[PDB]
Amino acid sequence: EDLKGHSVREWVSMAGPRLEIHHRFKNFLRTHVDSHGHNVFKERISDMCKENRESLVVNYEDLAAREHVLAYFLPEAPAELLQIFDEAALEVVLAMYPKYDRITNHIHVRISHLPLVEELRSLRQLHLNQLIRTSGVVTSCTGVLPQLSMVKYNCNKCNFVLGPFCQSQNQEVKPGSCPECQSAGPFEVNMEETIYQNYQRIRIQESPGKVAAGRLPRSKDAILLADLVDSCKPGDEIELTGIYHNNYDGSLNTANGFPVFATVILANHVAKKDNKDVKMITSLSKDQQIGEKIFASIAPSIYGHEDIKRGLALALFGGEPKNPGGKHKVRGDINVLLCGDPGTAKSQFLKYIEKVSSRAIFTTGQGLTAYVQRHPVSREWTLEAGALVLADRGVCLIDEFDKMNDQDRTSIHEAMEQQSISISKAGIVTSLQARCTVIAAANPIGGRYDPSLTFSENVDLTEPIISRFDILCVVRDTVDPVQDEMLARFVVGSHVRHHPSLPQEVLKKYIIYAKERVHPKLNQMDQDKVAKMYSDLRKESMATGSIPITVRHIESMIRMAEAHARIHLRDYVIEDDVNMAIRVMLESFIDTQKFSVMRSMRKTFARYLSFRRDNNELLLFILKQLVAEQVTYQRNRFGAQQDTIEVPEKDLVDKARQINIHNLSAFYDSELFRMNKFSHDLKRKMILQQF
């Protein structure tokens, strides 16, 4: 019988049960097929040996299936079963690979998903020395320090090395008196025969919103040994699995006044819970019309703003960070700066880009650089990373840009055109790297953006800073009846399906793929296609109170050139996406202009550039204004928010004569204006507007 009347701890420590368990584990290691007739621990051990990993995973459920008695002995006395399993897996591997002795000569078996997921606040004294599975964020980690594992001293009066004592993680090992000269004294270690092992200590704490319902969040310690160290960084969400081991502390006893012991989790398996094939992508990119299909995949909820959707999509994948051969270090990062009156889903545009992107971080402007910090655990005055070095390759989401401080302002600009920070702090003089794309949103002064002044006035920002941004989108608002329903219905419906009674799969894997397998090239056929525009537009802008497109705009345009090499896999500059690059680089410049200049420059260029746009949107641009202005008339004399606005026809083609389309019936058939709640009548000429 493998169960007799003793303590489970002391049953397994007896020679008989020890040997029985030892032989029992081998038979499971060698013979265990999984639903296909595959010795899983034959291929898995192999894949472990093809990397020199000395760590074997044992899923607990199968151990319970193929073995009824061990999977019940295990979480009772795991300080010895996990030792016997080591010597079993060793003798298995040294049979499947008889030379592996030259690789670390020691195997640890981890254990995966015990069936007893638990909380971090419900650990009571019942669980002392019992295998446990938990969860929660990690909030610290010391450095990987070396700890004694098999110490060996040497006597100071005889030149003889004492016995190889083992080190237990509760009390400093104590050597006796020299069995060769009885010279009991202060021995010192012998650095040459002693064996060491890695070591790291972390402080895990409850997840933010998971269980911390109406109280404060508790925390615990954990000790990662040799193979585990650096499995997790501050901010990760992990799920430990480890003996819950206690040890006596003399300080707590002097604070609480009672005999109180400290506890710590000797981690045994750490499995992160976070976010981590082309043959479709070939034709999906070869659709030739992936632009529209991807634009309406970001900003999943927020309606409208297919304008700024374009710019932010351009920013997300990025561009090409070419190295100029003249030692000029042009940058390959697109930085955006939103702005607009409060209540227009700017912050949501930030938060969704937090999710969709990768390796992203976030901050408010109300910590930007590395700073000296007294470590929670180690109690040393180290240096900690800021908020511009954690996006050293990804994105940095700044919020409340206006609320930055003078030191913060003088520190943000340095990283734009240099992308490299120096820290001559109290810690030590260093020079680190920072290659991030900045995505921020400012606010309008006076609680509303008013486009009589230039944008450089309502933004409340230092002038050489706005130059460090590529795109300048301006969010604005207006009381517009037909969009009131459009936005209301959306919000109301989003409140109907959220309460307890291109999808997000293509584009994440796509920003992973298309980030890598493209390297856009640069020919010289576009080199003269642009200057013909600059020579004109420079005069056109300088003529009035404005500064024309300058070199820091040509750089942004040429950066956004490749911004579509990532979507199309095109990677070849063509006179097609140059129509797009110039279009965007003027889109982000006509808006940041004066009252009558934002329209004079439009009347020139928006008709000059031959916007590669819909022929239909230019139809709407007319009658939308012609009905809005008529409502404005019929309010300033009557005041009644009338139900059905009425506008006869003749007015529309009068203004359509300027763009020379005169097409109404092919637009009347088009359902691209029914949504805007309009009408027309052949015999009445009325463009009847309902709402």
């Binding site: 704490q205 919103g209 009381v479 409140h495 309460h499 009674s501």
Partner: protein, 371 residues
């Protein structure tokens, strides 16, 4: 560590405190901000560093709330509808079936306030609370509504707040001039015993899922109105300090009272010029009750009559139905539904949002804090 309850404080004294030691399965019954009722033995404890000096310590064995709203034993409609004693449940039903209920809670909650019929209603709808939702992405919609009052001197502002804070259980009361940033939201304190920086809970936290009554909201400093907005927006409280990194929940509803700039409320300007709150904060309230002391004379008889009545018949002339203990029960019951929206009501709502924007329309009139 427990602190002397409020109703025992001798006048003109700072409240004492003592250490209680829960030592069993009773180990996490008491949380911060609660009003439990401990029952154990008083013991003496030495100073173990020199093992003298002794200090008193309470050694509790049982702990239970001081006044159970439902005397059965102490979370959905049925778990509570079980503890309802026969009279309790035959009364809650009677009220829920009552018609004109929405006028017998006002008349029975604020029995000594003549007028302002449009403020009591808002206060009630604040007490009942909305439906808190969590979007699938991971964000969360605010479920409870916030309310601010702004008015002339001596118009019964602090009286609404005192009424609400003495009626409601787990609702805290603070002034604005005598507070702090790290006292409202959350602090960080060095416990030299553990020689570590730990988190202290603030007024916005030990009133969680209740109501925080801020009087004189516009006397707070410029930097103390920032920490409160960072909490009123995301419903959470971040901490990033010496060795502490955390994010705490705060699902309180705020009832704030303020004063116009220069004493009186000037009715020829927008709101942003009559009050000195920040710009962001004025957006996070979404219910304002501007009170004005219209120099009338038919009221100045009514208010006079009511005050002199209250002062002549001190405990009488208050004839409210639905005694105050009963309303707590009805309010603990009816705060466990999650009403839904029918399609007709959704259409009505979008039409009303249509009919609200255009009132602010140009030409005919003008209003304050644009819709």
């Amino acid at each position: 560590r427990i602190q002397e309850t409020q109703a025992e404080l001798p006048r003109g004294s700072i409240p004492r405190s003592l250490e209680v030691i829960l030592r069993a399965e009773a180990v996490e019954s008491a949380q911060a901000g609660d009003k439990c009722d401990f029952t154990g033995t008083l013991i003496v404890v030495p100073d173990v560093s020199k093992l003298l000096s002794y200090r008193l310590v309470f050694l509790a064995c049982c702990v239970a709330p001081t006044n159970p709203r439902f005397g059965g034993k102490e979370q959905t409609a049925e778990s509570i509808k079980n503890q309802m004693t026969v009279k309790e449940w035959e009364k809650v039903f009677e009220m829920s079936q009552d018609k004109n209920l929405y006028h017998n809670l006002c008349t029975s909650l604020f029995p000594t306030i003549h007028g302002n019929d449009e403020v009591k209603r808002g206060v009630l709808l604040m007490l009942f609370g909305g439906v808190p939702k969590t979007t699938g992405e991971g964000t969360s919609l605010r479920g409870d509504i916030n309310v601010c009052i702004v008015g002339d001197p001596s118009t019964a502002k602090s009286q609404f707040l005192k009424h609400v804070e003495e009626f409601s259980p787990r609702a805290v009361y603070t002034s604005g001039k005598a507070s702090s940033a790290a006292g409202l939201t959350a602090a960080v304190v060095r416990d030299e015993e553990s020689h570590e920086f730990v988190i202290e809970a603030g007024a916005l936290m030990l009133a969680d899922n209740g109501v925080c009554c801020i009087d004189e909201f516009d006397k707070m400093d410029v930097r103390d109105q920032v920490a409160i907005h960072e909490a009123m927006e995301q419903q959470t409280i971040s901490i990033t300090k010496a060795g502490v990194k955390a994010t705490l929940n705060a699902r309180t509803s705020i009832l704030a009272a303020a004063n116009p700039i220069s004493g009186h409320y000037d009715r020829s300007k927008s709101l942003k010029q009559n009050i000195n709150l920040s710009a962001p904060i004025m957006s996070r309230f979404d219910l304002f009750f501007i009170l004005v002391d219209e120099c009338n004379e038919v009221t100045d008889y009514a208010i006079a009559r009511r005050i002199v009545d209250l002062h002549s018949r001190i405990e009488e002339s208050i004839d409210r139905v639905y005694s105050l203990d009963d309303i707590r029960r009805y309010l603990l019951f009816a705060r466990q539904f999650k009403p839904k929206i029918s399609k007709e009501s959704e259409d009505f709502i979008v039409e009303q949002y249509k009919h609200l924007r255009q009132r602010d329309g140009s030409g005919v009139t003008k209003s304050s804090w644009r819709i």
